Nucleic acid binder design. Structure first.
Ligand SMILES: [Zn+2]
Ligand SMILES: [Zn+2]
Lengths: 73, 183, 928, 182
RNA sequence: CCCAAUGUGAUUUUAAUAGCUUCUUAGGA
RNA sequence: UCCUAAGAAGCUAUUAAAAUCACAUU
């Protein structure tokens, strides 16, 4: 069921970015919102997985905002 | 508590009409049964009101305590849920950027989708460089990228011919690589 | 052979270079629009014209031009009459040149009239093309736009180049007709003065004026004593009215000497009273209208004079400067310190209005006077900063703060325990017929002002007033069922007091604070001020956080407590009477449960003959609604106040709606903006004013269907007489014919049976009449909305059904099934399965993601899911059993956690009834 | 009272149930006991009614005593707002327009245009900046205005040297420009 | 920051209505 | 002594209203 799992992961990923105070940077929040809303409207999984790689790269660029080496165990 | 009086009264009343005892005695028994039943119902109404009141208090304590437990832990729950869902998708591009990020190989930009777009990535050590850079090329997010410049931590430019095992102690790590999407 | 001798006589004395436009001696045949009323036919319709020969000019370099000589055959007695009338008006510069001659055909002399240098099309062809619009039949509109240089012939290759919403440049291409239409309005006032001074009597009709503005037909005029002539103009002006604002005709009145090559007039900035300018504009273009015009509606005689005079004010208010309208303020002294306060209002529709209870000196303020002076925008806007906001075309008043505010919307919360349960039951597999389509969409800081700028679709719109004043009396027949009137503050009902009070009152408390602080004598004393004074008020715009299938932002308008508290005391007795009624046209207050959906559908089917069903859509409905139709809706709701209010109290109440919910200031991000029109969601009357608008547009479509049908081809003598009387009741009677208003309502209620709820409707209609043209169809709504609502209605969002055993395709987002329930069949509603699964997966608060706290939530969603169990698709029938199986799991987990926490079981075992179908089936069986 | 009559009648009946052997006197004791008990239960029921009605009256009085507080509290906040806004009006600039009016009355929309000391301009893109504000002074509303500050959509200060065709992708649009009347 | 109206589900309190028991009083035998 | 007619007290059920809360339509 990978299309519904990608759309459900999009909602959880933007909820994590919002709690990390990304709304405090208007030019960054406006890109995260557009990647999220596109993944929800997508119809082919090969589009939705490319936009998921851009949206996740926001969270990985915020060095020290998540303990990724502990979350990834 | 008045049940004992109710139980003994109904047994004595049914025994009296079964044996055919005198009607004034059967009336004394029936009338005793009516007040004993009324005392049993009056006791039962008290316990049923106290049990109703305790069931509400126990329920409201459960809702109050568990609602506060949901609300207080939300940040740790969301991050744990996210890094659980990314394992079930099992996409190679998502796995490739997460497995690089464990080791400190992270992007400075949002990763671009269009051809010939700019990307910048941190390289912590030669032992990481060797797994992702190959000649003029760089491999990240399960795609091929072409390198256009590299810098020391002091912003001094470094040529791709300088980055080798024997020379690696002389470079000022972490390096920053700039690359473009190939197509 | 002979036709060259005719062609040379048609040229005559004049310098001309004519070419034949058909066969030379016989007449040409053309299809053209006519405004007609005889002893045997009446309407505004297309007919074949067959009496005329035609010739077209070449120029001096061999190219054809827009100049025709039109020649026709006469009976000799009509030829002598039309020559006798022409020689009296011959000196007028608004009259087309004529030549009268006799010529030989078939061996005999025949009389001819030639009419010189006419255009291809008439003023009736331009009016009939912009009314009655079809995007696949534009050929007359395209040729008029190209002939008069409005656009190149390449313009029509755009996708939807006519859609006012998708191609808003069409408002520039149509406004290039404006000065051509204004020169035609001026030539008509010259022709009326010529008829009067010459002593001539007759009717002016649009089919006798060319697109250069010249008048050319006199065969039905009569003589009278000189200086006592009478031009009749009642259809000419009224039928043309909606084209005057569409083509922006009076735009030249804004320039010096009214010359489009000179600069704009610079008005005195302090000026608010334009009463002498409005009276001068009326005498220039509408001199012979023959009904009294009041520039200020506070002078009008009744509701029908208010609708008449306001229609000229929406036209003339386009000339005056935008800063001149809105609240009028004065300096007053309270305890010796100077306040600025509103003491009147200037309206684009109602004119200038002044308050009757102004005090210039006061020693103290009551609690009632503190509400009025805190709600009034005067003290807020006079003490704020100047604002120039380049993000919008809407007018900006002031910034109330030193910073701008940007409001985001965050994503929904994910209920993972329900999604993992549904996936284990095999939901969401790829290629399934049930999938997720409803989500919470996030929004960035630009969203609030980006949604506000959609008020750019509200445009000044002038109605056909002779049509509108008939339609209002047939719309009022739908509201004869009910009762209404004023009530005291002790009789008012409030649903929820812990909701916002609007601006500024939300600084200090919820609506509960004001209903507790105001005694009933403070509340009854505020209502009595609004019958003698105008309170203008501020409204907040807030973004909405709720689930949807579409990603555009949604906003809600929070109306102030002064407006909310007093509108509720004027209207609530009627609104409670509309909601309590059953079997009516307006179905507000009726439930779908306990057999109510079946009773609604059995009522709309009525006793209609040859029945089909249809339903239709309103594009941009809340933004695009005209002010002339939102004023008409509140004048219909006020017709219940005939005993408790005078004519003066009813005017000052209307002014209070127009100052508070129609044209008012808007708080959006810490700044004040001027709203042009359209409905505000917090207006207590919104669902009821929408229902009056929805009936008005459906009555209008049936008048246009019947009046534009060719009356010679109607086979039934009853419907010929109905068409002939309808034309008189619009364009020739001037009082209400009550017996015809009852007869047209009785016709309409049989052949066109409606069920209405706010902006949503179903109709059951006679399909034999609708295909003959005797009642409305989906093309008549497309034509009306195009010129009336100024929006293009795509047929892709309309529907129709041929089989009544299927029911309506959609009403209130729910589909229908005919199903067996006991011994007999009933209609049941069902939702979209993706809306019911979406509400299980996605939630607006974090504590909604533990189901043991929330079992009441899943019982409510299973009541809406139940009808899906009777549907032929098993993937829809499984959605109800998913909800019942999850409710059992939640009670088993709740029972386990309660025992682990307290070592003692719950005593309420009665939760067992909620995982069995019998509790839910009882919601859809009659007799409760 | 009726209770003491009930308690003394209970003892008078109970001593005869215990040792008394005459039902005759028991029937007289029973009737007088049931009368006294009936009067006691009637007095207790009337007492209980008046007590429950007194708690309703006291809670109604507390609801009124708390509602007159909130009326007086909000009245002080409304007067504090209205009498503060009188300090922001430059009365010399407002007197000039109101004395020039024919009848002492003016449109509200002209008051910020003709009297405000300060302007905020909200700008969506660099083409709109260049067409309206380029330089350090500009003309709007038939007055001359001088720029004191610029800030971005994050409320960070922007220096005028940063706003150009080349650098415009690096700014958080819209910009807000604040100016004073020259 | 968080509008308006309508409908439905659940829990709690209060009023009325019926039966059920006892007490008191009165008529008839 | 029985039958009966009325009032009070208690018990039980039902209906209505109010408060609180969930969901749905526009
Ligand atoms: Zn009038
Ligand atoms: Zn009234």
């Amino acid at each position: 069921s990978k299309m519904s799992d990608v759309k459900c992961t999009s909602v959880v990923l933007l909820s994590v970015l919002q709690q990390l105070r990304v709304e405090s940077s208007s030019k960054l929040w406006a890109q995260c919102v557009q990647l999220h809303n596109d993944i929800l409207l997508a119809k082919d999984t090969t589009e939705a997985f490319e936009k998921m790689v851009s949206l996740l790269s926001v969270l990985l660029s915020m060095q020290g905002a998540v303990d990724i080496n502990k979350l990834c165990e | 508590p008045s049940y004992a009086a109710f139980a003994t009264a109904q047994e004595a009343y049914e025994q009296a009409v079964a044996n055919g005892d005198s009607e004034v005695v059967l009336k004394k028994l029936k009338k005793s049964l009516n007040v004993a039943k009324s005392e049993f119902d009056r006791d039962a109404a008290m316990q049923r009101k106290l049990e109703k009141m305790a069931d509400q208090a126990m329920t409201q304590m459960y809702k109050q305590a568990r609602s506060e437990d949901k609300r207080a832990k939300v940040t740790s729950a969301m991050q744990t849920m996210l890094f659980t869902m990314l394992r079930k998708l099992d996409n190679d591009a998502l796995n490739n950027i997460i497995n690089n990020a464990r080791d400190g190989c992270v992007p400075l930009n949002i990763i671009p989708l269009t051809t010939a777009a700019k990307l910048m990535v941190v390289i912590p050590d030669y032992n990481t460089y060797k797994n992702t850079c190959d000649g003029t090329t760089f491999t990240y997010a399960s795609a091929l990228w072409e390198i256009q410049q590299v810098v020391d931590a002091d912003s001094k430019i470094v040529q791709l011919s300088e980055i080798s095992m024997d020379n690696s102690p002389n470079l000022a790590w972490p390096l920053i690589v700039t690359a473009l999407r190939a197509n | 052979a002979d036709a060259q001798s005719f062609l040379n006589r048609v040229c005559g004395v004049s310098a001309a270079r004519l070419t034949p436009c058909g066969t030379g001696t016989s007449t040409d045949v053309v299809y053209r629009a006519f405004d007609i009323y005889n002893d045997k036919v009446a309407g505004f319709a297309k007919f074949l014209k067959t009496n005329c020969c035609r010739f077209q000019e070449k120029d001096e370099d061999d190219n054809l031009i827009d100049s025709y000589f039109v020649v026709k055959r006469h009976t000799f007695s009509n030829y002598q009459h039309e020559e006798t009338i022409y020689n009296l008006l011959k000196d007028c510069p608004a009259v087309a040149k004529h030549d009268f001659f006799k010529f030989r055909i078939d061996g005999d002399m025949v009389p001819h009239i030639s009419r010189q240098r006419l255009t291809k099309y008439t003023m009736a062809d331009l009016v009939y093309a912009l009314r009655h619009f079809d995007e696949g039949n534009c050929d007359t509109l395209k040729e008029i736009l190209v002939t008069y240089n409005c656009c190149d012939d390449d313009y029509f290759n755009k996708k939807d180049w006519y859609d006012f919403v998708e191609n808003p440049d069409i408002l520039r291409v149509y406004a290039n007709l404006g000065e051509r239409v204004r020169q035609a309005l001026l030539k008509t006032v010259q022709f009326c003065d010529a008829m009067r001074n010459a002593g001539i009597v007759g009717v002016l009709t649009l089919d006798n004026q060319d697109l250069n503005g010249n008048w050319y037909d006199f065969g039905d005029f009569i003589q009278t004593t000189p200086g006592s002539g009478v031009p009749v103009v009642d259809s000419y002006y009224s039928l043309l009215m909606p084209i005057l604002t569409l083509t922006r005709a009076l735009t030249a009145e804004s320039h010096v000497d009214t010359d489009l090559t000179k600069p704009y007039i610079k008005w005195d900035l302090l000026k608010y009273d334009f009463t002498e300018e409005r009276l001068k504009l009326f005498d220039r273009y509408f001199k012979y209208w023959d009904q009294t015009y009041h520039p200020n509606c506070v002078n009008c005689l009744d509701d029908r004079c208010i609708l008449h005079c306001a229609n000229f004010n929406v036209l003339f208010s386009t000339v005056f400067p935008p800063t001149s309208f809105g609240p009028l303020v004065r300096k007053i002294f309270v305890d010796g310190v100077p306040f600025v306060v509103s003491t009147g209002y200037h309206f684009r529709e109602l004119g200038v209005v002044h308050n009757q209870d102004v005090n210039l000196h006061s020693s103290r303020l009551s609690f009632k006077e503190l509400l009025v002076y805190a709600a009034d925008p005067a003290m807020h806007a006079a003490s704020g900063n100047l604002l120039l906001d380049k993000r919008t075309t809407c007018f900006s008043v002031a910034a109330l703060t030193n910073n701008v505010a940007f409001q985001t919307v965050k994503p929904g919360n994910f209920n993972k325990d329900f999604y993992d349960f549904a996936v284990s039951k095999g939901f969401f597999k790829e290629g399934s017929s049930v999938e997720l389509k409803h989500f919470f969409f996030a929004q960035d800081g630009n969203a609030a002002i980006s949604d506000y700028d959609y008020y750019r679709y509200n445009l000044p719109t002038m109605c056909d007033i002779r049509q509108l004043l008939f339609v209002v009396e047939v719309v009022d027949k739908y509201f004869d069922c009910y009762d209404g009137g004023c009530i005291n503050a002790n009789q008012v009902i409030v649903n929820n007091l812990d909701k916002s009070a609007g601006f500024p009152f939300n600084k200090w408390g919820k609506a509960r604070l004001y209903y507790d602080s105001m005694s009933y004598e403070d509340q009854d004393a505020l209502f009595a001020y609004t019958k003698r004074n105008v309170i203008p008020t501020i409204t907040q715009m807030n973004l909405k956080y709720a689930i949807s299938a579409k990603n555009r932002a949604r906003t809600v308008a929070g109306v102030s407590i002064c407006s909310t508290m007093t509108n509720r005391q004027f209207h609530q007795k009627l609104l409670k009477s509309i909601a309590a009624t059953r079997g009516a046209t307006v179905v507000i207050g009726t439930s779908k449960f306990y057999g109510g959906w079946h009773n609604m559908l059995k009522t709309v089917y009525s006793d209609v003959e040859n029945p089909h069903l249809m339903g239709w859509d309103y594009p941009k409905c809340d933004r695009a609604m005209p002010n002339m139709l939102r004023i008409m809706a509140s004048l219909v709701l006020a017709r219940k106040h005939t005993t408790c209010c005078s004519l003066s109290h009813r005017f000052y109440r209307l002014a209070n709606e127009c100052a508070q919910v129609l044209s008012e200031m808007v708080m959006c991000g810490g700044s004040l903006y001027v709203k042009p029109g359209g409905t505000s969601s917090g207006d207590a009357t919104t669902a009821y004013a929408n229902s009056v608008f929805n009936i008005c547009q459906a009555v209008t479509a049936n008048v246009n269907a019947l009046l534009s049908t060719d009356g010679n081809k109607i086979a039934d003598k009853y419907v010929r007489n109905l068409q002939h009387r309808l034309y008189e009741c619009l364009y020739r009677n001037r009082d209400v014919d009550t017996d015809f208003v009852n007869e047209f309502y009785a016709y309409l209620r049989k052949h066109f049976s409606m069920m209405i709820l706010s902006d949503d409707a179903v109709v059951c209609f006679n399909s034999t009449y609708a295909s003959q043209g005797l009642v409305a169809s989906i093309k008549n709504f497309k034509s009306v909305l195009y010129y009336q609502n100024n929006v293009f209605m795509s047929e892709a969002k309309c529907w129709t059904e041929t089989d009544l055993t299927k029911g309506p395709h959609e009403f209130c987002s729910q589909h229908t099934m005919l199903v067996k329930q006991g011994d007999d069949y009933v209609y049941l509603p069902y939702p979209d399965p993706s809306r019911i699964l979406g509400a299980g997966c996605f939630v607006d608060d974090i504590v909604k993601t533990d189901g043991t706290l929330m079992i009441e939530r899943f019982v409510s969603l299973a009541i809406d899911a139940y009808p899906l169990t009777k549907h032929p698709n098993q993937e829809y029938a499984d959605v109800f059993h998913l909800y019942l199986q999850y409710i059992r799991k939640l009670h088993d987990e709740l029972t386990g956690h309660m025992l682990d926490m307290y070592s003692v079981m719950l005593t309420n075992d009665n939760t067992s009834r909620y995982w069995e179908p019998e509790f839910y089936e009882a919601m859809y069986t009659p007799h409760t």
